[PDB]
Copies of this chain bind each other. A is one copy, B any other.
Amino acid sequence: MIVGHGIDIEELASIESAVTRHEGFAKRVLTALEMERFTSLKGRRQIEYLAGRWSAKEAFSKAMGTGGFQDLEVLNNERGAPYFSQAPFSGKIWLSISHTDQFVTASVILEEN
């Protein structure tokens, strides 16, 4: 049975301005392992990754009905799909992410069998 559902949309411009102002933004939004991936990328690619991780965590927060990013983590499997490797929920989590050159979107569904 379903126990929650949430979505989010975000402009890349908002993430770009946030990086400059408080140059510690990333350290507070990403975990250690996520951070390693961030620094290895460059250009638009680097910004698109940070933006997608922020949108995914926000969708999950809305799905649980609450308003701690450090106890949430999103990685990529060998085929390339994104999945939650760490979260305060013991059921199953179904996630998906997509983008364009101007913004990103994400969708989450929570289930308990």
Contact = CB atoms under 8 A, between A and B. Distances in A.
Contacts of A109: 2, 5, 109
Interface stretch (A21-29, A36-44, A45-53, A95-103): A95-103
A100 B99 CA distance: 14
A105 B97 CA distance: 12
Chain copies in complex = 3
Contacts of A16: none
A9 B101 CA distance: 11
A67 interface: yes
Interface in A69-96: 79-81, 92, 94-96
A62 B96 contact: yes
16 contacts: A2-B2, A2-B109, A2-B111, A5-B94, A5-B95, A5-B107, A5-B109, A7-B97, A7-B98, A7-B106, A7-B107, A62-B96, A63-B96, A65-B81, A67-B81, A105-B105
Interface of A: 1-2, 4-11, 14, 62-63, 65-67, 79-81, 92, 94-103, 105-107, 109, 111, 113
